[PDB]
Amino acid sequence: FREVVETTIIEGRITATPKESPNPPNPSGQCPICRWNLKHKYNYDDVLLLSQFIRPHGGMLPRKITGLCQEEHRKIEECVKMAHRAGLLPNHRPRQLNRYLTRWAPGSVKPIYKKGPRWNRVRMPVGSPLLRDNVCYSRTPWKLYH
Amino acid sequence: SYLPGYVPKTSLSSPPWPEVVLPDPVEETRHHAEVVKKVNEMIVTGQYGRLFAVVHFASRQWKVTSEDLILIGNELDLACGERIRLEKVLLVGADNFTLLGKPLLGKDLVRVEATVIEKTESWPRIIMRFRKRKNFKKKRIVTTPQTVLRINSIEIAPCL
Amino acid sequence: SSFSRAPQQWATFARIWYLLDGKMQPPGKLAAMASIRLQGLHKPVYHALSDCGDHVVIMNTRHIAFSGNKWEQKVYSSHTGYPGGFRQVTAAQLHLRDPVAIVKLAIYGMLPKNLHRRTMMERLHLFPDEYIPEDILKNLVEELPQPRKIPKRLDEYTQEEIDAFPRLWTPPEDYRL
Amino acid sequence: TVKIFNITDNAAIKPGTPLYAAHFRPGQYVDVTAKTIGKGFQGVMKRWGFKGQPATHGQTKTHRRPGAVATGDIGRVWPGTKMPGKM
Amino acid sequence: TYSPLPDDYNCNVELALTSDGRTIVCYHPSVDIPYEHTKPIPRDQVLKTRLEEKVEHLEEGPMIEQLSKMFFTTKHRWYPHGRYHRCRKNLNPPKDR
Amino acid sequence: VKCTKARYLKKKNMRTLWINRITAASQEHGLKYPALIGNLVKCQVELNRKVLADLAIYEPKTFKSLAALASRRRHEGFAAALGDGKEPEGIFSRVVQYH
Amino acid sequence: GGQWRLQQGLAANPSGYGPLTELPDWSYADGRPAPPMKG
Amino acid sequence: MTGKELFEMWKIINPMGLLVEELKKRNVSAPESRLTRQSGGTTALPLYFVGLYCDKKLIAEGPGETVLVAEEEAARVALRKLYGFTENRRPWNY
Amino acid sequence: FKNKTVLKKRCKDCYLVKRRGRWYVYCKTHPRHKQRQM
Ligand SMILES: [Mg+2]
Ligand SMILES: [Mg+2]
Ligand SMILES: [Mg+2]
Ligand SMILES: [Zn+2]
Ligand SMILES: [Zn+2]
């Protein structure tokens, strides 16, 4: 990678970089996810993959450098936000209520003071419509709204 | 060298249930032969006691053992104190083993013997119909015939 | 089984003390398995008139987890019946006041709406932390398995699985990161 | 009378000890709790200070009574409704 | 190496089919509890050791609260019942086995 | 009138109780009620819910063998579905034909 | 399992044209066949 | 005598004493009582399953509300087993 | 702010930001362009 220090002299150097694992199983893919056959087989739990795709301080890396396609990039964005909210990344921090699958920012949602009738019920969103299309491994689909 | 189709260990890569390998039919077949032989020699020597059976009779299935009573809801064209053979035995079992038919057990394998010991009537059942504001009201009293059978014996024979 | 009649009946209708953990578990799945055990629906000798419930002891109710945004969207409504008694508190506020109220309310909702419900509620025991009284701890049998699988934060992955997971993308060697 | 006072641990005094009026000091502020003068069963005009009904101008036997106690739509009376009782 | 169910809580189930395939044979001998899995059984100089026979009389309130705490029930089970139900209760009930 | 309609209600409630007790025993053996019932039918075992609940209460070893048989049939069905070809039918999935 | 029974050809209701419904329920203890059932 | 139990027909007093006498006369070591299973214990409705072992081999097990009645029931079950009158025994041939 | 169902950028200096779950038009140079999504 590349690092800059300030001492007033500012200087940048190249540090050691990682490389691919040598033989991808699908070399004809375009995005790294498509190459490594992970098109619908990841969730917000896969912090190994997300830590591969994030910045050291919790932010993300852009598409033109990650090589991801747009759909995969948006899915990784949402997975990373949910992992950050669930607390699965304790070392990628900036500068007690237990959660998981947190879609919205916890400080921006308002309480559902008035649920509607059962035909117009105000539901509580869980998960991601981007992650709607993952492999189910179950005979009932995901329940995106509780 | 990763094989074509290798998916890395993620939470949705593999199915959540454990992989089950079934034993191959050849040694499974000889193992079935050994188990059948062991149960058959247990039958021959007689290492069992107080057999029970699940028996299909009169559109029912009854779980009976020896010295039992059952109350069939119809007359059976049989005098009192008459010994008959219950024949449609779905299950016979004991401590340490159990035989299951598909769906009926062989008649050379298990024999259920019962005895008509009572032919009686049920208590009077009331059938009333009422519909309000329509003057609708009917009353009937029925009494179904009934037959008490005593299950005397359940015998199994070595035929496996 | 050759037991005498009174010990056989006592053994069949005996009462069991199950243990259940909180600690990142959803209150409703905890409530579902707790309510099954409280009604006694797990027994093959179940009948609604046979008083066949069991004791359920749930610990770590202070460390339950809600999926989604239920901590801020879920509202518990009560009414002190004077004019103006309508109170609505979010799940966060209710948890911060009473650390057992959320699991208690979920179990109370999922029990059958009978006169047996409060008897099941007396047999339910809830503790917010690791601490359980000694009498309960000498009564417990069968810590039941937890419904969720604790999705394993990044730092306690060992180096073996970290370098077993492949690197997906090649970084340019000039990028700041 | 025995009355219970909440104290911290540093203000514990041995049981059986005498206490006098010099425990306080002049120029201080205190709180005094007691059972008030009981007045028995009283109506709304003394218990809650309702305005009552006018004396003359046609009124039949209603001068000191509560009027409505609720509305028509509720088929009941709300808890805490001010009604005559013990003062 | 395959077992359809775990073989360490009730019985060692071995399933089999006869040679004609017409009947299924189950062999289920009971499992015993191991010795190492059991637990051992738990274990005035001048006057007579008299009987400590004290029975405090509780009122209805504290007594029902004590019984409720003892048996993990509510109070309504311990509150009494009237003569109508008391005489309605069948005192020679039918009894099977 | 309540007696006459309670005949139908009695039959329905008895079947509901049997399903409850079979579900209890099946989940005690790690299985589910639909899995147990469907795979016993696939094994050609025609015990109804009444005698299945009786076997649950009074013959736990026989019920454990039945649950093992249903689990074995379910694993045979999964193996056949995964294989999708002309692998042998499986020992317990063989159907006894009648003519 | 009505669909499974239809796939195997064994009706759909287990009380339909099978041996479990058409074979006689009982016989005399000596071995004499019973009279035929009314259904 | 069809539907009754041995210690309902023949009344005994010390099943543990009868059991140890029988084991001494059939040269089996003395039965050790152990707490096989236990539920409750500090409550008013406990369950104790006490098992009788011989040479680290289980010969009987019995339930009760107290350890003492559980071990006497285990003694009765052992006596029934080694007296042949068990509940699952072969029924009488009439 | 003014409440709008549809938000429009009335300047080159207006900017759309999504804050507390709702969209906003903020303008540092023409503060009358402040808009809040309903
Ligand atoms: Mg006036
Ligand atoms: Mg007048
Ligand atoms: Mg006047
Ligand atoms: Zn892609
Ligand atoms: Zn502007």
**Is C166's CB within 8 Å of B8's CB?**
yes
The C-alpha atoms of residue H64 and residue H58 are separated, in whole angstroms, by: 18
CA distances from F19 to C7, F13, F26, F53 (A): 28, 10, 10, 8
CA angle, B43 then B44 then B46, to 5°:
60
Q: Is A117 helix (H, G, I), strand (E, B) or coil?
A: coil
Strand-by-strand arrangement of the B60-65 sheet: B60-65, B52-57, B89-94, B96-101, E23-28, E14-17
User: Tokens for B131?
Assistant: 């519909």
Stated as kind and residue range, the H or E segment containing F68 is helix F60-83
* Contact assessment for residue A40 and residue A33, using Cβ atoms and an 8 Å cutoff: no
**Is F20's CB within 8 Å of C43's CB?**
no
User: Tokens for A61?
Assistant: 């890396």
The pair phi, psi for residue B138, each rounded to 5°, is -130, 145
Q: Is A73 left (phi over 0), alpha (psi -120 to 50) or beta?
A: alpha
Burial class (CB in 10 A: 0-12, 13-18, 19+), F55: buried
A42 Cα to the center of ligand 4, angstroms: 13
The neighbour count for residue G23, using CB atoms within 10 Å, is: 13
Distance from CA of residue B150 to its chain's centroid? Answer: 17
C158 Cα to the center of ligand 4, angstroms: 29
Name the neighbours of D, counting chains with at least 3 Cβ pairs within 8 A.
Answer: C
User: Which of B2, B9, B11 lies closest to C165 in CB terms?
Assistant: B9
Among H63, H54, H56, H59, residue whose Cα is nearest residue H82:
H59
The C-alpha atoms of residue B96 and residue H2 are separated, in whole angstroms, by: 23
Q: Distance between the two ends of chain C, CA-based, in angstroms?
A: 72
* Contact assessment for residue F71 and residue E3, using Cβ atoms and an 8 Å cutoff: no
- What is the domain count for chain C? 1
D48 Cα to the center of ligand 2, angstroms: 28
Residues of B in contact with C151 (CB under 8 A): 11
Q: Is A59 helix (H, G, I), strand (E, B) or coil?
A: coil
Among H22, H2, H13, residue whose Cα is nearest residue H72:
H13
CA distances from A52 to A19, A46, A92 (A): 12, 10, 12
The C-alpha atoms of residue I38 and residue A128 are separated, in whole angstroms, by: 24
Q: Is F73 helix (H, G, I), strand (E, B) or coil?
A: helix
The C-alpha atoms of residue F14 and residue G27 are separated, in whole angstroms, by: 31
Q: Is H42 helix (H, G, I), strand (E, B) or coil?
A: coil
Among B23, D22, E33, F7, residue whose Cα is nearest residue H74:
E33
* Contact assessment for residue F72 and residue E18, using Cβ atoms and an 8 Å cutoff: no
Residues of B in contact with H90 (CB under 8 A): 48-50
Among I36, E4, B97, residue whose Cα is nearest residue F61:
B97
The C-alpha atoms of residue B84 and residue B89 are separated, in whole angstroms, by: 14
Among B149, B106, B143, B108, residue whose Cα is nearest residue B126:
B143
Question: How far apart are the CA of D67 and the nearest CA of chain C, in angstroms?
Answer: 18
* Contact assessment for residue B116 and residue B79, using Cβ atoms and an 8 Å cutoff: yes
Domain span including residue C170: 1-177
**Is H73's CB within 8 Å of C3's CB?**
yes
Question: How far apart are the CA of H81 and the nearest CA of chain B, in angstroms?
Answer: 13
CA angle, B13 then C68 then A79, to 5°:
40
Q: Is G37 left (phi over 0), alpha (psi -120 to 50) or beta?
A: beta
* Contact assessment for residue F54 and residue B63, using Cβ atoms and an 8 Å cutoff: yes
Name the neighbours of G, counting chains with at least 3 Cβ pairs within 8 A.
Answer: B, F
User: Tokens for B137?
Assistant: 């009201």
Residues of E in contact with C123 (CB under 8 A): 72
The neighbour count for residue C145, using CB atoms within 10 Å, is: 8
Any chain C CB within 8 A of the CB of E72? yes
Sole residue written with tokens 């005399």:
G28
Evaluate the CA torsion angle A134, A135, A138, A140 in order and state its sign. Answer: positive
Distance from CA of residue C144 to its chain's centroid? Answer: 10
User: Which of E14, E23, E30 lies closest to B99 in CB terms?
Assistant: E23
The pair phi, psi for residue A19, each rounded to 5°, is -135, 175
The C-alpha atoms of residue F61 and residue F37 are separated, in whole angstroms, by: 18
The C-alpha atoms of residue H36 and residue H62 are separated, in whole angstroms, by: 9
**A6, amino acid identity:** E
- What is the domain count for chain A? 1
User: Tokens for C97?
Assistant: 């006041």
Find the farthest-apart pair of alpha carbons in chain I and give their distance in angstroms, rounded.
24
CA of B10: which chain C residue's CA is closest?
C165
CA distances from H55 to A12, E39, E40, F40, H30 (A): 79, 15, 15, 42, 8
User: Tokens for F76?
Assistant: 């045979």
CA of F17: which chain C residue's CA is closest?
C47
* Contact assessment for residue A70 and residue A105, using Cβ atoms and an 8 Å cutoff: no
User: Tokens for E65?
Assistant: 């609260």
Per-residue buried b or exposed e for B106-137, using 16+ beta carbons within 10 Å of the residue's own CB? beebbbbbbbbeeeeeeeeeeeeeeeeeeeee
Question: How far apart are the CA of F54 and the nearest CA of chain C, in angstroms?
Answer: 9
Among B118, B147, B152, residue whose Cα is nearest residue B60:
B147
Q: Is F25 helix (H, G, I), strand (E, B) or coil?
A: helix
Burial class (CB in 10 A: 0-12, 13-18, 19+), F43: buried
* Contact assessment for residue B121 and residue B144, using Cβ atoms and an 8 Å cutoff: yes
The pair phi, psi for residue H67, each rounded to 5°, is -60, -35
Residues of F in contact with E30 (CB under 8 A): 61
Residues of C in contact with E76 (CB under 8 A): 115
The C-alpha atoms of residue A51 and residue A88 are separated, in whole angstroms, by: 10
The C-alpha atoms of residue A42 and residue A134 are separated, in whole angstroms, by: 7
Q: Is B105 helix (H, G, I), strand (E, B) or coil?
A: coil
Quick check: bond before C166 cis, omega within 30? no
**Is E24's CB within 8 Å of F62's CB?**
no
D50 Cα to the center of ligand 1, angstroms: 10
CA distances from A63 to A92, C167, C176 (A): 20, 17, 15
β-pair partners for F83: none
Q: Is C161 helix (H, G, I), strand (E, B) or coil?
A: helix
CA distances from I14 to C164, I17, I28 (A): 49, 10, 7
Among A120, A23, A26, A30, residue whose Cα is nearest residue A69:
A30
Question: How far apart are the CA of E34 and the nearest CA of chain F, in angstroms?
Answer: 19
The pair phi, psi for residue C130, each rounded to 5°, is -60, -20
* Domains in chain F: boundaries: 1-99
Radius of gyration of chain I, Cα coordinates, nearest whole angstrom:
9
**Contacts of A13 by beta carbon, 8 Å cutoff, 6+ apart:** A2, A3
User: Tokens for E17?
Assistant: 């089919």
Distance from CA of residue B146 to its chain's centroid? Answer: 22
The C-alpha atoms of residue F43 and residue H66 are separated, in whole angstroms, by: 45
User: Tokens for A123?
Assistant: 């539901």
* Contact assessment for residue C24 and residue C62, using Cβ atoms and an 8 Å cutoff: no
* Contact assessment for residue C50 and residue C60, using Cβ atoms and an 8 Å cutoff: no
The C-alpha atoms of residue F25 and residue C45 are separated, in whole angstroms, by: 9
User: Which of A21, A23, A49 lies closest to B10 in CB terms?
Assistant: A49
Any chain E CB within 8 A of the CB of C95? no
B-H interface (Cβ pairs under 8 Å ≥ 3): yes
Find the farthest-apart pair of alpha carbons in chain G and give their distance in angstroms, rounded.
41
Query: Percent helix, strand and coil across chain G, each rounded to 5?
Result: 30, 10, 60
Evaluate the CA torsion angle F41, F45, F46, F50 in order and state its sign. Answer: negative
Residues of D in contact with C84 (CB under 8 A): none
Evaluate the CA torsion angle C65, C68, C73, C74 in order and state its sign. Answer: negative
Distance from CA of residue H18 to its chain's centroid? Answer: 11
The C-alpha atoms of residue A86 and residue A90 are separated, in whole angstroms, by: 10
β-pair partners for I19: I22
**Is F51's CB within 8 Å of B62's CB?**
yes
Tell me the DSSP string of E31-90: PPPPGGGSEEPP---SS------------HHHHHHHHHHHHT--STTTS---HHHHHHS-
The C-alpha atoms of residue F70 and residue F76 are separated, in whole angstroms, by: 10
Residues of G in contact with F41 (CB under 8 A): 1, 4-5
Any chain B CB within 8 A of the CB of F96? yes
**Contacts of A83 by beta carbon, 8 Å cutoff, 6+ apart:** A44, A45, A47, A50, A89
Please give the method by which this entry was determined.
Answer: cryo-EM
Kindly give the pairing relationship between strand B82-86 and strand B110-121.
Answer: antiparallel
Return the ligand number nearest the Cα of D61: 3
CA of C83: which chain D residue's CA is closest?
D78
Q: Is C139 left (phi over 0), alpha (psi -120 to 50) or beta?
A: alpha
Tell me the DSSP string of H50-76: EEEEETTEEEEEEEESSHHHHHHHHHH
Per-residue buried b or exposed e for B144-153, using 16+ beta carbons within 10 Å of the residue's own CB? eebbebbbbb
The C-alpha atoms of residue B5 and residue A29 are separated, in whole angstroms, by: 13
The C-alpha atoms of residue B93 and residue B112 are separated, in whole angstroms, by: 12
Most F CBs within 10 Å, among G3, G8, G13, G15, to test the F interface: G8
Residues of B in contact with F51 (CB under 8 A): 54, 61-63, 91
β-pair partners for B57: B60
Sequence length of chain D is 87
The pair phi, psi for residue A100, each rounded to 5°, is -160, 155
Domain span including residue A5: 1-146
Strand-by-strand arrangement of the I2-4 sheet: I2-4, I35-37, I22-27, I14-19
Any chain F CB within 8 A of the CB of G5? yes
* Contact assessment for residue C23 and residue C58, using Cβ atoms and an 8 Å cutoff: no
Task: Find the chain H residues whose C-beta atoms sit closer than 8 A to any C-beta of E.
Answer: 3, 33-38, 43-45, 50-51, 53, 56-58, 61, 67, 71
Tell me the DSSP string of chain C: ----HHHHHHHHT---EEEEE-SS--HHHHHHHHHHHHHTTTSTT--TTTT---EEEEE-GGG-EEETTHHHH-EEEEE-SSTT-EEEEEHHHHHHH-TTHHHHHHHHHHS-SSSSHHHHHHHEEE-SSS---HHHHHH---BPPPSS-----GGGS-HHHHHHSPP--PPPTT---
Stated as kind and residue range, the H or E segment containing H21 is helix H15-25
**Is B99's CB within 8 Å of E26's CB?**
yes
Burial class (CB in 10 A: 0-12, 13-18, 19+), C55: buried
Return the ligand number nearest the Cα of I32: 5
Domain span including residue H24: 14-88
Stated as kind and residue range, the H or E segment containing B120 is strand B110-121
**B89, amino acid identity:** V
Among B102, B100, H62, residue whose Cα is nearest residue F62:
B100
β-pair partners for A3: A13
The C-alpha atoms of residue I17 and residue I28 are separated, in whole angstroms, by: 13
Among B53, B59, B67, residue whose Cα is nearest residue B150:
B67
User: Tokens for B76?
Assistant: 């059976």
The C-alpha atoms of residue E74 and residue E85 are separated, in whole angstroms, by: 20
Among B137, B150, B146, B160, residue whose Cα is nearest residue B42:
B160
Residues of B in contact with A49 (CB under 8 A): 10
Question: How far apart are the CA of D83 and the nearest CA of chain C, in angstroms?
Answer: 14
User: Which of C1, C7, C15 lies closest to H39 in CB terms?
Assistant: C15
**D48, amino acid identity:** W
The C-alpha torsion from B77 through B81 and B82 to B87, rounded to 10°, is 90
* Contact assessment for residue A137 and residue B12, using Cβ atoms and an 8 Å cutoff: yes
The C-alpha atoms of residue B51 and residue B44 are separated, in whole angstroms, by: 15
**H89, amino acid identity:** R
**Is B126's CB within 8 Å of F43's CB?**
no
The C-alpha atoms of residue F57 and residue I29 are separated, in whole angstroms, by: 81
Burial class (CB in 10 A: 0-12, 13-18, 19+), D50: middle
Beta strands in chain A (DSSP E): 2-6, 10-14, 98-100
